[PDB]
Amino acid sequence: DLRPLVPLDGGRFATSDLNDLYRRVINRNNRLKRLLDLAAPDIIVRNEKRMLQEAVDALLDNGRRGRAITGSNKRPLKSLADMIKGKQGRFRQNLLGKRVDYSGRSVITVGPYLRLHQCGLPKKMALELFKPFIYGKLELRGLATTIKAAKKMVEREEAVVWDILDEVIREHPVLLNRAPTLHRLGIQAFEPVLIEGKAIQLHPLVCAAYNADFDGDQMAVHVPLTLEAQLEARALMMSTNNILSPANGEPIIVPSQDVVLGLYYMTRDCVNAKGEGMVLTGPKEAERLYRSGLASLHARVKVRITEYEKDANGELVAKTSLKDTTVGRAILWMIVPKGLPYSIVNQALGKKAISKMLNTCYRILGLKPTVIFADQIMYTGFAYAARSGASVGIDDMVIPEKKHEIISEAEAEVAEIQEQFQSGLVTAGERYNKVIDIWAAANDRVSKAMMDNLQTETVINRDGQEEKQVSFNSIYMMADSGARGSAAQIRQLAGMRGLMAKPDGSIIETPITANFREGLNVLQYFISTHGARKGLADTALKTANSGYLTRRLVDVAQDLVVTEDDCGTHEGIMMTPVIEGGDVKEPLRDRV
Amino acid sequence: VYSYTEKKRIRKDFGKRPQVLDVPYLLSIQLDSFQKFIEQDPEGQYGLEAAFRSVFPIQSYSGNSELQYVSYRLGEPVFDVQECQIRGVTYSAPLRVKLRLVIYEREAPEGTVKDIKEQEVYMGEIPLMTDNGTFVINGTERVIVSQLHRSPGVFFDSDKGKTHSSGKVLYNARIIPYRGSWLDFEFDPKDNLFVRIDRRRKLPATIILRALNYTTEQILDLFFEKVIFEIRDNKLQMELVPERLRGETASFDIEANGKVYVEKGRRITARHIRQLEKDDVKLIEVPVEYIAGKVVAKDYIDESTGELICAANMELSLDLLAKLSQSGHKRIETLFTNDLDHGPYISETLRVDPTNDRLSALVEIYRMMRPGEPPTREAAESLFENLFFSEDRYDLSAVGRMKFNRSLLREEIEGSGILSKDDIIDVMKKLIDIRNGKGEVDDIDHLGNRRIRSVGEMAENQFRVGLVRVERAVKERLSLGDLDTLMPQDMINAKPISAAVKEFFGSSQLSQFMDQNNPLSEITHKRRISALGPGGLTRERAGFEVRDVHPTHYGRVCPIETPEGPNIGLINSLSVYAQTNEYGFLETPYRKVTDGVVTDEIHYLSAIEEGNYVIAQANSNLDEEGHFVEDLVTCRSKGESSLFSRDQVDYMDVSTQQVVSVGASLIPFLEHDDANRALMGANMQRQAVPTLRADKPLVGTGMERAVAVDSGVTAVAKRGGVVQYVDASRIVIKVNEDEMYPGEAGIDIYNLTKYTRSNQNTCINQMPCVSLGEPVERGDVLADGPSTDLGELALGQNMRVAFMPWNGYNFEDSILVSERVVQEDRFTTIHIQELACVSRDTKLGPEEITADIPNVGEAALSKLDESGIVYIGAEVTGGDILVGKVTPDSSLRVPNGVSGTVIDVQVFTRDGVEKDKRALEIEEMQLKQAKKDLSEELQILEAGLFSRIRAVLVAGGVEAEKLDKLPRDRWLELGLTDEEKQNQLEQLAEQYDELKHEFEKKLEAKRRKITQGDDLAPGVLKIVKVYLAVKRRIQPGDKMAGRHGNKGVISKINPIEDMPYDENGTPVDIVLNPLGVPSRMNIGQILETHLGMAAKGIGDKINAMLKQQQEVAKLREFIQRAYDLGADVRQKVDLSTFSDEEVMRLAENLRKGMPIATPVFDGAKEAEIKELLKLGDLPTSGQIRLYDGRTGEQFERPVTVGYMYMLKLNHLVDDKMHARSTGSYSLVTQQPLGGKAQFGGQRFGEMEVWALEAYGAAYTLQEMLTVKSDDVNGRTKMYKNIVDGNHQMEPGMPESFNVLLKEIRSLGINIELED
Amino acid sequence: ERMGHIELASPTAHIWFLKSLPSRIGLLLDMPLRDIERVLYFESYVVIE
RNA sequence: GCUUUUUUGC
DNA sequence: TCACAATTCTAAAAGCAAAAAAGCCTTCTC
DNA sequence: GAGAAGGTTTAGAATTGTGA
Ligand SMILES: [Mg+2]
């Protein structure tokens, strides 16, 4: 039965390889038996015994020696050893990694209304995973008498099974797992919430942990059965008990892109807006001004706020005062938990500012307020990001006026150096290096020109003479606020996209003077392709090597457990801040 | 000019560059090759003629009875393409070759044949290429992808610095033949010259020379120049050429003519040799110390003792010098050896070798090749002669010979494929020359070294292999048997040839299953060149440099279309204009530019030949006659973009569209995307699934028309004419008489295809696109296949997108769709699923198909005929019954989930089983449609004959009134004179008779073909196939994309009352996230959105001025104004030549936005987009001001709306969802099955176990790999406990562990568990 | 669970122990593997005492 | 219910 | 003797998923 | 027809080939 002969479809039998090898060895043993019985001459008995030795050598470990035996197909057949070793033997395929019941798979989409510990699970899938629990509760409630009747009832989907299912789904965590589970946070327990649809709805704030956007990914959900399993999912894995990375201290609930844009745009300031300068009794008045159109979400306003400093040991002490903020910062203040100080929400909240704000919440107050705070931050970010209507158009990326002149001057300079080479006064290598240098200079100059143009583009007047403020451009906001992108990408979108590297590392001597809001001619695009294909090949052929490295590391260090309280030794390591020639790279505080 | 079918919708066409060469026929790559494969070929260089001429004539061991070649013919298919798909059998043709066996006489080299026996012998079928480039092997439609490999030749590689751990530069010289053995010459850190064959054990090089009829003197003469020492009265005066001294030190006093020319201690330089040659120095004295440092060239033997004085290639020492000095010989030949300009590599190699003679060389090679067998002189001689110098076993292809000669700077291109001694020694000398410093290595990425196979060449090689196996068989048999008795066919038997061809086509790494869910998918699955396959590299061993893009792929291979994944850069796609050379190498066209004037003669340039010239740039402004307006133009001289003067150019590029494949040329504004986004867009536009009602792009590139027509999807007219009868199932076109043949009174019938399954389970139908009485000219479409619209290529719908964040329902890549799109079925598709019931004859009772089913009531029986089979048109759901079949309960149940009607049933039964009643009904139905359709094929010919009778029967005793009394037939026996008129009447009667005969003779065969059974699998009664046809809607989870790589998964279907609405009331239809664009820099999508808004604004203006009727004058004025807008736009449509009825049809085809064509790299600009926006009434910035549906308040920050073209990719959420609670388990290891077809469970791989260990969840892990998976008694107890109400487990121990335990035990390794 | 067995008419060498590289039998009998496999495959005679 | 080949998604 | 050092041979090369098609010995014979 | 029936890319360890 460990090598079955299964009648395939209709009328034929599929013989496993081992049956072939055993048949061959039995045949050739019978031949040797007869030959030794008849006492044949020496040469043929030698040949027969040799070839029996060969048949067994193929049986136990095929193809170890030359001329691996092949069956019907041209390929070698699999022996015992090849049935144990390798990536398809029992050790890596059926013992360490098993297929598992009570488990489904589906696309993941975004449900932006769930709480940080919930996942929307479809009704069809959920009803199919929790079938035995449904049978149990039907039997216990008596609505069906026997498992046959219960099975028919669930298979026909009467009107009662839905309320039964909503009962058996109440406090029953389910493990969501994304395909290449890379680190500890790729498996997480979640509270199901039944959904009508066929996609698993996954709270946005956990995507970063999973490294999962919604370009059509897929997750597998497993169900814990027993009580230890349910408590373990609830106490160890649940998505609220995992808000710090294990590899370092940094939190793993950084609000990512739309929410950070909403908070940034909300909590900004502009030198003139509706309702500038008035005084508001508190945050609530700020909200009911902004919601009625009488003032702008960001207009400079004095507001009377009360912050709770907990200087008293485990006791909050209130402090009332007047602050200079905007309507946006007061509205956002309405959600921050008690013990925080007001200066923590009183600047344009980028991504770093928000992440440290969550970190300080976690540090001062603990866990539960931080979970509530992360939820409220997501909701407010999404709402006011939507209300901003922050869109992107072609006019939101402006070529600097000076780029024409800069590129013309660099053209003149390279013409001068080329003429210098025509006279032989400059060696080839020096000519090349100097051309590269002047082009790098031109690129830097034009990039700074466009950044100066964008970063303060807006010019506006309060009641008279003009004034300069940071610019409300859409793409500048997308990059500055940390939402999505950096300065290099915006440089390519507006200023010239520098020089490009031939695949051998050589830098070509003709930069791409044309950005993307203008065209690239055919040749510039071809050069860009050199650059891009290199990177794609890198990722494709690097994922495999990384996986192998991680496998080796785990299979070495898979025995360390923390077993004792103090081994009682005085040795150690002398840690000091590291210095790589220049300044101190890693300071002592982070080191120790 | 304009057609009368391209005049229904004219694409307002931006783009300034007037292209000269039209886009070629995109399928030529495979059509031409397989045309060459089968062609009755005089002079037989390629095709089957080449194979037969190569393998024949066959000669026995002077058996005086030999066989030769005459001719070969391909018969006709037993089945045309469509019934080959319907049935399942290969669309083939039989091959018949005219063999001729001739029996000589005794002692008859001069003796005439005594017997000649000739016939056609039948050897096997060969599959044929349908007119679309595809093959039909067993019903399914396969494509034999091209292959890119290394052209045979000689290649001098470096192995630059990654050897010996000291930065040495080895050098290698490989010979790659077309069929034979690789021969490699290579170097060693110790500076030896080694050889190897077949990459197996290595040897000193010179041994092969020792095997080529050589002695050491010849070798030394070959690879060295001699230096003359002359023993003289004063210490060996020496004869010196000045040029042998450059870059050397002064080891002595260079003196002559009683004068010291150069002194010791200094070093010889250029001026020194200048002084020497000016003075014409002949001989120079030198001390013996320098003479001691050379090696003797020739073996020197004493004239007295007849014994060796000094053998060759050994250092001359003072002792040997003394011994030979008095030997009497005054001339010594040594070897010039400068460590820079030369090297004695062959000398040390001759030191190393263990051989001395030809016998030693041959035995060494033979021990090298086949160990175990002791050497034999004759066997080794035969082997080394057969390994390289027997054309039957080794062969450079003619391309191989061309590359071989070109590399070695030879002068002819023709040659002989068998190697020669001269060629080997010349390769050796070239390799050494590279080593010395002169000459440079050849890389392997160059498209000069890489060569395209095809269906023709691959098929020829397979047929040749089969045929040489067969000629071996006939040769073996022909030396035996009585010759005069046997006809020349009873020895071939044809089995190997058919076996080989069928095996290559059916199952090969390149003859692969067709991608058929578009016209684009097919037309770009055919122009694919694959680096892989037999005779090519492989994905794992595939390097990292081949995957990169060489600077010479410009114009030959696309840079931005390659499937990322394991094989990225190994599967290339062939560029638009690229054609293949006479040899295999890729050309691209180029305009000839003699002087500054850019002449209009196009020359195709290959890969190697493209480097020498300096080729201008496709977009270099020229002013109406062809002078490059600019002073410094750009060019690409030799793989190096550079800047050249106004006149150095020797070629220009044909078109700006020539660097990109077809699939990447349908993306508008390609020159604004990043390269990665362009790649992903080109790759997803090939997965778009065709929807119910096709919609034109509305921002295109003008390549949609060519792509749509250049696939075989659309039924295009062969001879123009006037439509005569249109229908959803056929079209009948009356050919214009001018184009008509001299006779046969032809018309054209087109049988549109209706609701058939594609390979990917999609619906391929064809809708007529012409009205009745409509004139259709030659080459104009009639039927719009899937995703086609008026002969364009409509892959998706154009939807009103707005870019903004909307409550995080479009967070990362998600899309937020309106319910207005689900309502209208914009993205609804039709899938067709072919289920099969195979009715075998099992034991314990031969099976049946009776409708009688035990153990069922009437719920399942209410959807069946009395034979059990389902009525065609019956909606079914999961778990129903479709075919009646019970055990002596194998009834084909509808698998779970698959739904929808049953559009088609087909039953094949083998000859021998009585057809059942529904088989009777179906075959009778098919017979009736056959008879009807092939009576419809009768036409006005007979009526024309009757009219001819009437014209000839004008009078002469004729009843003019009674002509129409009786039917027109009896017009022959009526009264007539006795002249030629009566003879003509009899001739018309004869015509009538043979008309009956000719139509009846053809009509009979259909009875035979329909009636007969067909070849099933042995043992099966009949195959019954049902065809369900589900219809998929859109829903959350369904993946959607644009053309610029901006994919995403639908997240919410939002009610129309909630979408943002601009002030005019019109709700937005999709909402996309802006935050995507700046990071993944695809600015193409924004520009497409703005141009779409402009175009739909123009279309709205036309629809307003048309619906609220205004006279045609205003319409022609406005349409003309829209068609002018621009600058140097090359189109220039003249609208005053339409006659106020073509304008009305046109303007009725423009009420849904005016289409635009924006070619790939010289598309529209910002300024012209703004102009077009102004021509409507829309704001110029592109951004309008939107209101929020849910709250009605206005959005700050104006938002970007427009019309973007959205596709629907074939990754549907309902084919991905899957769940399992308990099902069936595998047999060996009792673990759940894997897959969605099987009710399978999700794998819990290793990495997830590591995650669980890291958390510390030990109980979850234990229940995860003991109960839920594998412990049999444990999981049954678990199920029982769960149903009961108690949540607990008794784990036990796996049953996939005991398997391992026993398999290790069945080795000799006792493994056991202890206390 | 129930196995079976086959009685070889003559002895035979276990490949795993013979050519594990390093080889157990080889360095247990202090004599190379080329000749050991040559003897095993009936191509030489090996003396004992 | 097993092996291979090909393709595609992440 | 006994030591480098060159040649040979074995071991490995991410994970999950879906689809599709192939497929199960030559010959020798009554 | 069909039953018989013998059929790359690197690295690490191990050998032996001069070279002392
Ligand atoms: Mg993704």
Asked whether residue B1242, judged by its CB, lies under 7 Å from any atom of the DNA or RNA strand E, the reply is: yes
Pairing of strands B300-301, B248-249: unpaired
Query: Are the CB atoms for B508 and B502 separated by under 8 Å?
Result: no
d(CA B627, CA B593): 10
Q: Chain B: list its partners (3+ Cβ pairs within 8 Å).
A: A, C
d(CA B945, CA B995): 10
CATH number, position A433: 1.10.132.30
Please list every residue in chain C whose beta carbon sits closer than 8 Å to the beta carbon of residue A25.
Answer: 6
Place of tokens 């390889």: A17
Residue–nucleotide distance: B925 CA to F2 C1' (Å): 38
Whether residue C3 and residue B1306 make contact (CB cut-off 8 A), yes or no, is yes
Q: Ligand 1: distance of its center to the CA of A216 in Å?
A: 6
Query: Are the CB atoms for B453 and B149 separated by under 8 Å?
Result: yes
Whether the bond between A132 and the residue before it is cis, its omega within 30 degrees of 0, is no
A569: tokens are 């030794």
Please name the residue of chain A whose CA is at the shortest distance from the CA of residue C15: A57
Whether residue A29 and residue C6 make contact (CB cut-off 8 A), yes or no, is yes
Domain of A417, in residue numbers: 402-534
Residue–nucleotide distance: A74 CA to E11 C1' (Å): 24
Q: Ligand 1: distance of its center to the CA of A539 in Å?
A: 14
Q: What residue has its CA nearest to the C1' of E18?
A: B1216
Query: Are the CB atoms for B1077 and A516 separated by under 8 Å?
Result: no
Asked whether residue C25, judged by its CB, lies under 7 Å from any atom of the DNA or RNA strand F, the reply is: no
Q: How many CB pairs under 8 A join B and C?
A: 9
Whether residue B1231 and residue A199 make contact (CB cut-off 8 A), yes or no, is no
Kind and range of the H or E element at B155?
strand B153-157
Q: Ligand 1: distance of its center to the CA of A262 in Å?
A: 24
Query: Are the CB atoms for C42 and A49 separated by under 8 Å?
Result: yes
B1249: tokens are 């176990």
B767: tokens are 């809708």
Q: How far is CA B1174 from the centre of its chain?
A: 46
DSSP per-residue letters across B851-876: S--TT--STGGGG--TTSPPPTT---
d(CA B780, CA B790): 10
Please list every residue in chain C whose beta carbon sits closer than 8 Å to the beta carbon of residue B1298.
Answer: 1
Pairing of strands B115-127, B92-103: antiparallel
| Beta pairing partners, B669 | none
Asked whether residue B414, judged by its CB, lies under 7 Å from any atom of the DNA or RNA strand E, the reply is: no
Question: Helix (H, G, I), strand (E, B), or coil: what is residue A136?
Answer: helix
Of A117, A103, A372, the closest CA to residue A235 belongs to A117
Please list every residue in chain C whose beta carbon sits closer than 8 Å to the beta carbon of residue A64.
Answer: 15, 19
Place of tokens 């329909």: B1010
Please name the residue of chain B whose CA is at the shortest distance from the CA of residue A97: B1245
Please name the residue of chain C whose CA is at the shortest distance from the CA of residue B1302: C1
Please list every residue in chain A whose beta carbon sits closer than 8 Å to the beta carbon of residue C7.
Answer: 29
Q: Ligand 1: distance of its center to the CA of B428 in Å?
A: 54
Asked whether residue C33, judged by its CB, lies under 7 Å from any atom of the DNA or RNA strand F, the reply is: yes
Query: Are the CB atoms for B952 and B985 separated by under 8 Å?
Result: yes
3-state helix, strand, coil in chain B (%, to 5): 30, 20, 50
Whether residue B1308 and residue C3 make contact (CB cut-off 8 A), yes or no, is no
Please name the residue of chain A whose CA is at the shortest distance from the CA of residue C37: A65
Instruction: Report the C-alpha dihedral over residues B787, B790, B791, B796, rounded to 10 degrees.
Output: -30
For the B713-787 domain, the top CATH level (class) is mainly beta
Q: Ligand 1: distance of its center to the CA of A534 in Å?
A: 21
Pairing of strands A187-195, A118-122: parallel
Fold of the B656-712+788-827+1033-1216 domain: 2.40.270
Q: How far is CA B942 from CA B132, B738, B869, B939, B974, in A?
A: 36, 21, 43, 7, 19
**From the CA of C35, how many Å to the nearest CA of chain B?**
14
| Beta pairing partners, A324 | A302
Query: Are the CB atoms for B829 and B1208 separated by under 8 Å?
Result: yes
Q: What are phi and psi of A375, to 5 degrees?
A: -60, -55
Question: Helix (H, G, I), strand (E, B), or coil: what is residue A320?
Answer: strand
DSSP label of B1058: T
Longest dimension (CA), chain A: 123
Say which nucleotide is closest to residue B515, CA to C1' distance.
Answer: D7
Put simply, the chain B residues between 1016 and 1075 with a CB less than 8 A from any chain A CB are: 1017, 1019-1020, 1035-1037, 1039, 1047-1051, 1073-1075
d(CA B1142, CA B5): 10
Say which nucleotide is closest to residue A26, CA to C1' distance.
Answer: F6
Asked whether residue B188, judged by its CB, lies under 7 Å from any atom of the DNA or RNA strand E, the reply is: yes
d(CA A265, CA A251): 23
Q: How far is CA B249 from CA B229, B303, B1211, in A?
A: 20, 38, 76
Task: Please give the method by which this entry was determined.
Answer: cryo-EM
Whether the bond between C22 and the residue before it is cis, its omega within 30 degrees of 0, is yes
d(CA B310, CA B313): 9
Q: What residue has its CA nearest to the C1' of E12?
A: A548
d(CA B659, CA B652): 13
Query: Are the CB atoms for A374 and A115 separated by under 8 Å?
Result: no
Question: Does CATH number 3.40.640.10 belong to domain B152-224+343-443?
Answer: no
Q: How many CA atoms lie within 13 A of B248 on its CB side?
A: 21
3-state helix, strand, coil in chain C (%, to 5): 35, 0, 65
Query: Are the CB atoms for B515 and B523 separated by under 8 Å?
Result: no
Contacts of B902 (CB under 8 A, 6+ apart): B870, B871, B872, B873, B874, B875, B876, B882, B1026, B1027, B1028, B1029
Q: What is the CATH number of domain B828-913+1014-1032?
A: 2.40.50.150
A502: left (phi over 0), alpha (psi -120 to 50) or beta: beta
| Beta pairing partners, B1293 | none
Report the residue of A64, A79, A85 to disrupt the C interface, i.e. the one with the largest count of C CBs within 10 Å. A64
Whether the bond between B786 and the residue before it is cis, its omega within 30 degrees of 0, is no
Whether residue A57 and residue C42 make contact (CB cut-off 8 A), yes or no, is no
Q: What are phi and psi of B55, to 5 degrees?
A: -85, -30
- Nominal resolution (angstroms): 3.6
d(CA A176, CA A222): 7
Q: How far is CA C28 from the centre of its chain?
A: 12
Query: Are the CB atoms for B615 and B601 separated by under 8 Å?
Result: no
Query: Are the CB atoms for B99 and B119 separated by under 8 Å?
Result: yes
- Between the two ends of chain C, the Cα-to-Cα distance in Å is 45
Contacts of B950 (CB under 8 A, 6+ apart): B963, B968, B971
B1308 → closest Cβ in C1, C3, C14: C14
Whether residue A56 and residue C9 make contact (CB cut-off 8 A), yes or no, is no
Q: What residue has its CA nearest to the C1' of F2?
A: B1018
Q: Enumerate chain C positions whose Cβ falls within 8 A of a Cβ in B.
A: 1, 3, 14, 16
3-state helix, strand, coil in chain A (%, to 5): 45, 15, 40
B1188: tokens are 């929020």
Q: What residue has its CA nearest to the C1' of D1?
A: B1226
Query: Any alpha helices (H) in B390-438, and if so which ranges?
Result: 398-407, 421-436
Q: How far is CA B85 from CA A247, B516, B1051, B1304, in A?
A: 59, 14, 40, 50
Whether residue C14 and residue B1306 make contact (CB cut-off 8 A), yes or no, is no
Asked whether residue C36, judged by its CB, lies under 7 Å from any atom of the DNA or RNA strand F, the reply is: no
Asked whether residue B186, judged by its CB, lies under 7 Å from any atom of the DNA or RNA strand E, the reply is: no
Q: How far is CA A470 from CA A454, B699, B1274, in A?
A: 9, 37, 68
Place of tokens 């010019």: A459
Of B1190, B732, B1163, B866, the closest CA to residue A522 belongs to B1163
Task: Tell me which amino acid residue B1105 is.
Answer: M
Contacts of B854 (CB under 8 A, 6+ apart): B886, B889
Please name the residue of chain C whose CA is at the shortest distance from the CA of residue A60: C15
d(CA B357, CA B207): 9
Query: Any alpha helices (H) in B847-979, and if so which ranges?
Result: 917-936, 941-952
Q: What is the CATH number of domain B575-655?
A: 2.30.150.10
Question: Helix (H, G, I), strand (E, B), or coil: what is residue B1252?
Answer: helix
Task: Tell me which amino acid residue B1304 is.
Answer: I
Of B247, B179, B752, the closest CA to residue B457 belongs to B179
Q: Ligand 1: distance of its center to the CA of B561 in Å?
A: 20
Residues 1-20 of C with CB under 7 A from strand F: none
Question: Helix (H, G, I), strand (E, B), or coil: what is residue A127?
Answer: helix
Q: What is the CATH number of domain B914-1013?
A: 6.10.140.1670
Strand D contact nucleotides, protein CB < 7 Å: 1-10
DSSP per-residue letters across B1018-1077: TTEEEEEEEEEEEEE---TT-EEE-SSS--EEEEEEE-TTTS-EETTS-B--EEE-TTHH
| Beta pairing partners, B248 | B268
Place of tokens 């195709």: B604
Question: Helix (H, G, I), strand (E, B), or coil: what is residue C3?
Answer: coil
**From the CA of A9, how many Å to the nearest CA of chain C?**
28
d(CA A135, CA A123): 17
Binding site residues of A, as ranges? 213, 215, 217, 567
Q: Chain A: list its partners (3+ Cβ pairs within 8 Å).
A: B, C
Q: Ligand 1: distance of its center to the CA of A381 in Å?
A: 23
Q: How many CA atoms lie within 13 A of B643 on its CB side?
A: 11
* Residue ranges of E strands in B167-244: 172-176, 183-187, 193-197, 202-204, 226-230, 238-239
| Beta pairing partners, A304 | A322
Residue–nucleotide distance: B99 CA to E25 C1' (Å): 33
What does chain A come to in residues? 592
CATH 2.40.50.150 range(s) for chain B read 828-913+1014-1032
Binding site residues of A for Mg(2+), as ranges? 213, 215, 217
Q: Ligand 1: distance of its center to the CA of B1047 in Å?
A: 10
d(CA B181, CA B388): 8
| Beta pairing partners, B95 | B74
Query: Are the CB atoms for A579 and A585 separated by under 8 Å?
Result: yes
